Amino acid sequence: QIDGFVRTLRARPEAGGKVPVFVFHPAGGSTVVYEPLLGRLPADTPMYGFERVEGSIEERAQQYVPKLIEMQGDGPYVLVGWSLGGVLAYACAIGLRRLGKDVRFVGLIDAVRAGEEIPQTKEEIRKRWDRYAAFAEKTFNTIPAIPYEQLEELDDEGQVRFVLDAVSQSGVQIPAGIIEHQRTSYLDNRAIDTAQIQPYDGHVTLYMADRYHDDAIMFEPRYAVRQPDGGWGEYVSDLEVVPIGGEHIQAIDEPIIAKVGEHMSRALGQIEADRT
Ligand SMILES: COc1ccc(OC)c(-c2ccc(-c3cn(CCc4ccc(C(=O)N(C)C)cc4)nn3)cn2)c1
C-alpha cells in the first residue's frame, strides 16, 4: 500500500487495464487528498500517489521519473497534481518528454504562479522574516532584532533551522511532530519559488480556481494577484483552462472536485478509446 514514496490509491489490474493516474503530494500533505478526485474518475481507474522526497523541484523529479518509467514504461502517462503537486507533475512531464516518453495528460489543479516573481535576495529574506516575526509576536510571546546577517546567507532550510534553533535556545520546546508538519509545509511550498519551469510540448489542463485563500497570501503576499492563465501560457502552447471557481484550498475537495473529475474523466475516456 505504501512502497517507498509510492502510495497505491487504487492498484492497477495484474495485467492490462486502464491507464493509471499518477498524483503528486501537496506541501504539508499526503496523496490521500486525491481520494475525492478518485471517486469522481471512471471505475477501475488505477491511481498511484508520489509522496515527499528531498531537494529542489528538479531534484525531486529526478527521483520520481525513474520510478514512473519502472511502473508505466513507454506510457501513456497521465500526471495530476494540486498545489505543489501540480508543479511536481509538470516537472515530471518535462523529464519524461526528454526521455521520449508518451505524456498524454497533465492536470494542474490550481497550481498557479505568484502574480510577481519572488526575489532571491537578502532584502527579500529580511522582509519576509520581519513579517513572520511580527505575526509570531501576537503568537507565543518582543522578538529580539532578527540576526539578518546569518539569516540572509542561508537557503530556506537553513533559515528555518536557524529560527527553530533560536526558539529552542530561548526556552520554547516544540513537539517534533508540530515542527515536522510546519517545517515541511513551509519548505515544500518555498521550493516552488525557484522552480526551473521549462516549455512543454503536450496537452495541459489547468483547473483554475478564482483566487488563493488568505493563508497562502499571508505565507507569500504575491499570491494575492494571479493571471487568467496562472502563468502557464508562455510555457504551454497547448493549454486548456477549466474554470472551477472558489479558493485554492477548496479545489481538491467536494463539491468542486466533481467539476475537475467530470472533465478529467472525459480526457481519460478519450485516451482509453485511442488505445485501440
Ligand atoms: C518560479 O518559476 C515559476 C514559473 C512558472 C510557474 O507557473 C506557471 C511557477 C509556479 C507554478 C505553480 C505555483 C504554485 C504554488 N502553489 C501553492 C502555493 C501555496 C499553497 C498553500 C499555502 C498555505 O496555505 N500555507 C499555509 C503555506 C501556501 C502556498 N501551487 N502552485 C507557483 N509558481 C513558477
Author numbering: 1451 to 1591, 1593 to 1727
Q: How does the study describe this entry?
A:
Pks13-TE was preincubated with X20404 (series 1) prior to crystallization. There were two molecules of protein per asymmetric unit, each bound to one inhibitor. Unlike TAM16, which inhibits by blocking the entrance to the catalytic center of Pks13-TE, X20404 binds closely to the catalytic serine (C23 of the X20404 is 3.25 Å from Ser1533 OG) and engages more extensively with the enzyme in a hydrophobic channel that likely binds the alkyl chain of the mycolic acid. This channel passes through the central core of the enzyme, extending from one solvent-accessible side of Pks13-TE to the other. The channel occupied by X20404 was not completely visible in the Pks13-TE-TAM16 structure because the side chain of Arg1563 blocked it. To accommodate the R2 group of X20404 required the displacement of the Arg1563 side chain, and an entire segment of the protein from Thr1645 to Gln1649 is also shifted by approximately 2.4 Å (as measured at CA of Thr1645) to open the channel compared to the TAM16 bound structure, as shown in Figure 3C. The Phe1670s side chain, which flips to stack with the benzofuran core of TAM16, is positioned to form edge-on pi stacking interactions with the R2 phenyl of X20404.
Pks13 is a multidomain enzyme that performs the final step in the synthesis of mycolic acids through the condensation of a long-chain fatty acid (C24–C26) and a very long-chain fatty acid (C56).12 The product is transferred from Pks13 to trehalose by the Pks13-TE domain. Pks13 fulfills a critical function for Mtb by performing a condensation reaction of a long-chain fatty acid and a very long-chain meromycolic acid to form a mycolic acid. Pks13-TE is a validated target for the development of antibiotics for Mtb. In previous work, we identified TAM16, a potent lead molecule for Pks13-TE. X-ray crystallography verified that compounds from all three different series were binding deep within the active site of Pks13-TE, displacing the side chain of Arg1563 with atoms within about 4 Å from the catalytic Ser1533 OG.
